[PDB]
Symmetry: C5
Subunit: 126 residues, 5 copies
């Protein structure tokens, strides 16, 4: 019935302000709820600050040792179908592996079940 | 359809009790559901306690090594449009990078789908 | 419209079985959904087990290095308005900083939107 | 109104395949939504794999350094009232403290609020 | 009433691109909401990137020290009953233990309670 799209990428760090075109993501033509998961291991004893821009949105990201963070982001529109992509900034280096996942869902009406019948009603406005 | 606002900031630590005006946040004029994500890497082998005040609300924050914490916070009002900002306190130092993100959503009615029709009803009050 | 109460505390460790009266929490007179966030940094290379009692409820808590854990706890009543407070137990020591946050929400009806109109109904019971 | 039951335990590791009867848990007679929180600190520089069986369900668990994981588990039945208990397996040792929490909730109808009145309806089937 | 299926596995690392047939998972014949939990401890001082493919879906995974990550994934269909299984890729080695859990739920209508009766309605279309 309902659909899904988890577009994803596994990347590296070199230039400040780089794009990362997202792997194997064909399109997200319609409306969607959206989420980010991000984490990045560090080569050596160094700490890394950074920020992640997706679609007019931006996210803070301190790190050292082990990390994992997620973000719900409500109901992003897609005005016209395109490939997913992510711009971001922060310190880069010889070794600082990156892992980033976008998950987006179609918005659908929720099914419901009614309790307490019969249910009161009047023609008149409240 | 629905809107969103993830206002954000990436900062440092010097004075006790400082404000951090939040980056690139124009306004949040209406009612909103709200959330915090906070994490802060440590320069050197030191641990840091701290607390974060947003809007009449305050949050505890122990840390060492790697950290990441989030908080749902229900339905904050915005009486009049302003720039987002965050006051906080705790130990500061030569190196203790900070990363903080606010995400807020408009509150909207949820769409629903009805199951089990036809549905019972009576004019009379229960 | 809807209200909120994030009562909070930032504390230390000395005696077994201590109370910690919670900072700046005036009252929670009515019914509420509730949540805990807890984390505690360790002075030195030591591990700490502990348990946290709130309101007839109790929570397990292993720790070393960095920690952060959260708990939803459904719909706690408040029979009469009081100050928030937390009892707990476990190993204590020279340095083991504690951070604990309670977040509670009023329970309110959810707004809804109806899909699929017109909606079928019959006077007769199913 | 609504009830709750957070049954809990703080334990050790010796035999493979042990039970841990859960502390201070009197009964859960009816239907319930359920959740696990598990974490276990390590004595020494060692890593621990393990799995946790609850009620016909089983859970994977790698660990080293600091850990914390949670699991929603939908709507477990309780055919007849009993004490909570947990079987599990994996490497054990001289020091590997365990912390495990079960939280379960009664399933109740959700209250709702209606938007968009008046609402269309027809006697005829769709 | 409602059912559940937490199929699971605890594994090792050798070849690139291996399958892991999932332990003790008999079938998931119908429609389901789905979730992943993944974490993997590291033998030695090494970091590991990897990606996890389930059902036409793929997930990023940086790691070092301690890790734990989870993913909601909406409403996966099961066209015909089969055993659960997971393909994945990344660096492998002498010691890099893996822990992976799938949790899936039947999709069911939600029960509801009505507030604000009596409820307005008109025969006429809006």
């Amino acid at each position: 019935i309902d659909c899904d799209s988890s577009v994803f990428g596994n990347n590296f760090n070199i230039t400040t302000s780089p794009q990362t075109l997202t792997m194997s993501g064909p399109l997200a033509p319609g409306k969607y709820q959206t989420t980010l998961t991000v984490q990045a291991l560090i080569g050596g004893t160094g700490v890394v600050v950074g920020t992640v821009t997706f679609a007019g949105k931006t996210v803070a990201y301190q790190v050292f040792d082990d990390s994992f963070a997620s973000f719900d982001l409500g109901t992003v529109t897609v005005s016209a179908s395109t490939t997913p992509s992510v711009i971001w900034t922060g310190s880069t280096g010889a070794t600082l592996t990156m892992a980033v996942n976008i998950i987006c869902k179609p918005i659908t009406p929720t099914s419901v079940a009614i309790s307490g019948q019969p249910i009161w009603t009047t023609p008149y406005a409240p």
